[PDB]
Amino acid sequence: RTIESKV
Amino acid sequence: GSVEEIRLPRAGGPLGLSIVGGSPGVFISKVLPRGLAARSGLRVGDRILAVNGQDVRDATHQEAVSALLRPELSLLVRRD
């Protein structure tokens, strides 16, 4: 559902 | 609402941010206090509207991830 992408 | 053009100097290192959302919108969820994003004006809650001219307003989360990382980088954001 939800993604948090650390870049 | 306000729109600002942010510029992060690509240094082959962590841009210093995290994003959430997509297909509505890609919002910055975390900004490292010592990261590039914090040193260049990015803030939590900002909506990424464009990455080096590519319109990511309605981009998928992974569409935005590739734009952000795929090879100075310009981010246009909306901010209230």
Residue numbers in the entry:
A (entry chain D): 11 to 17
B (entry chain B): 10 to 32, 44 to 91, 94 to 102
Question: Which statements did the authors publish about this structure?
Answer:
Scribble is a highly conserved regulator of cell polarity, a process that enables the generation of asymmetry at the cellular and tissue level in higher organisms. Scrib belongs to the LAP (leucine-rich repeats and PDZ domain) protein family, and features sixteen LLRs (Leucine-rich repeats), two LAP-specific domains (LAPSDa and LAPSDb) and the four PDZ domains (PDZ1, PDZ2, PDZ3 and PDZ4). The influenza A virus NS1 protein was shown to bind to human Scribble (SCRIB) via its C-terminal PDZ binding motif (PBM). Examination of the SCRIB PDZ:NS1 complexes showed that the NS1 peptides are bound in the canonical ligand-binding groove formed by the β2 strand and helix α2.
We determined crystal structures of SCRIB PDZ1 bound to NS1 ESEV PBM (A281-R219-T220-I221-E222-S223-E224-V225), SCRIB PDZ1 bound to NS1 ESKV PBM (A281-R219-T220-I221-E222-S223-K224-V225) and PDZ3 bound to NS1 ESKV PBM (A281-R219-T220-I221-E222-S223-K224-V225). In the SCRIB PDZ3:ESKV complex, Val225ESKV is docked in the conserved hydrophobic pocket formed by SCRIB PDZ3 Leu1014, Gly1014 and Leu1016. Additionally, hydrogen bonds are formed between Lys224ESKV-Leu1016SCRIB PDZ3, Ser223ESKV-Ile1018SCRIB PDZ3 and Ser223ESKV-His1071SCRIB PDZ3 at the α2 helix. Glu222ESKV side-chain reaches over to the β2 strand and forms an ionic bond with the Lys1039SCRIB PDZ2. Although SCRIB PDZ3 K1040 formed an ionic bond with ESKV seen in the SCRIB PDZ3:ESKV complex, it appears not to be a critical contributor to the overall affinity, with loss of the interaction only modestly reducing the overall affinity of the SCRIB PDZ3:PBM interaction. SCRIB PDZ3 K1040A showed a weaker interaction with ESEV (22.2 ± 1.1 µM) and ESKV (13.8 ± 0.8 µM) compared to the wild-type SCRIB PDZ3 counterpart (ESEV:13.1 ± 1.6 µM, ESKV:12.1 ± 0.9 µM). SCRIB PDZ3 H1071A revealed complete loss of binding for both ESEV and ESKV, whereas PDZ3 K1040A interacted with both (ESEV: 22.2 ± 1.1 µM) (ESKV: 13.8 ± 0.8 µM). Our ITC analysis of the ESKV PBM revealed an interaction with SCRIB PDZ2 (KD = 9.5 ± 0.7 µM) as the tightest interactor, followed by SCRIB PDZ3 (KD = 12.1 ± 0.9 µM) and SCRIB PDZ1 (KD = 30.0 ± 0.9 µM) as the weakest interactor. Interestingly, there were no significant differences in the interaction of SCRIB PDZ3 (β-PIX:14.7 ± 2.1 µM, ESEV: 13.1 ± 1.6 µM, ESKV:12.1 ± 0.9 µM). Additionally, S1026PDZ3 interacts with the β-PIX W641, whereas S1026PDZ3 is not involved in the SCRIB PDZ3:ESKV complex; instead, a K1040PDZ3-E222ESKV hydrogen bond is formed.
